[PDB]
Write a protein that binds this DNA or RNA. Structure first.
Ligand code: NA
Length: 199
DNA sequence: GACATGATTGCC
DNA sequence: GCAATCATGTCA
């Protein structure tokens, strides 16, 4: 609470926000009062209407993705492949948000392991957008919550960034190629390294 | 109402 | 290399 990043932090455009997320710690307070912690090491920016890789492309706006259009810091959690969740945080700009792709586990590792068992090496706990949601017990109920004012989840300030193309956007179009994915260089917790982009 | 599909994960 | 599994986006 005293460390929780507030409203002013989130009110930034997608790219600066996605880059600013690196190093920050995502915290999840479970019912047993225990708190799980993960330092963000990989994120992706979705610019909005012009961004053909975003759900909000062409100004598309529905009840499912309303979060992207809500105040910065508002969560947009959705179900993919009818089996996994993806956690995004609305940024400045309607239809713009930041997807979280990987965290470096810091605390509550044992609970995460249990959560993701449905023996896992720590490297398999949060190395992915859906894995991290599973590891932190994030689900559809976290959709549209305010990361700056929620009792169960918040971001804390943390004490070389690689910019690469996003994952699972395809190999067609200028937007699929744009370097809108950012992660901690040399980090062993990133979900997908891009040796090419690192050079 | 119907029908194609996914910013993944993980086993063959 | 590809199946799992179903809410959502579209078209009607
Ligand atoms: Na937004």
């Amino acid at each position: 609470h005293l460390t929780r990043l507030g409203l002013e932090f989130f009110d930034q455009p997608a790219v600066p926000l996605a880059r600013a997320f690196l190093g920050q710690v995502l915290v999840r307070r479970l019912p047993n009062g225990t708190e799980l912690r993960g330092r963000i090491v990989e994120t992706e920016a979705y610019l909005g209407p012009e961004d053909e890789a975003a759900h909000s492309r062409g100004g598309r706006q529905t009840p499912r993705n309303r979060g992207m259009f809500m105040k910065p810091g508002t969560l947009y959690v959705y179900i993919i492949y009818g089996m996994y969740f993806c956690m995004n945080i609305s940024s400045q700009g309607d239809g713009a948000c930041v997807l979280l792709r990987a965290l470096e586990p810091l605390e509550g590792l044992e609970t995460m392991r249990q959560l993701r068992s449905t023996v896992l090496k720590d490297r398999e706990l949060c190395s992915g957008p859906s894995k991290l949601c599973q590891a932190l017990a994030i689900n559809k109920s976290f959709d549209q919550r305010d990361l700056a004012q929620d009792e169960a989840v918040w971001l804390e300030r943390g004490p070389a960034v690689v910019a690469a193309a996003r994952v699972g956007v395809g190999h067609a179009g200028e937007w699929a190629r744009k370097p809108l994915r950012f992660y901690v260089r040399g980090s062993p917790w990133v979900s997908v390294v891009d040796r090419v982009a690192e050079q």
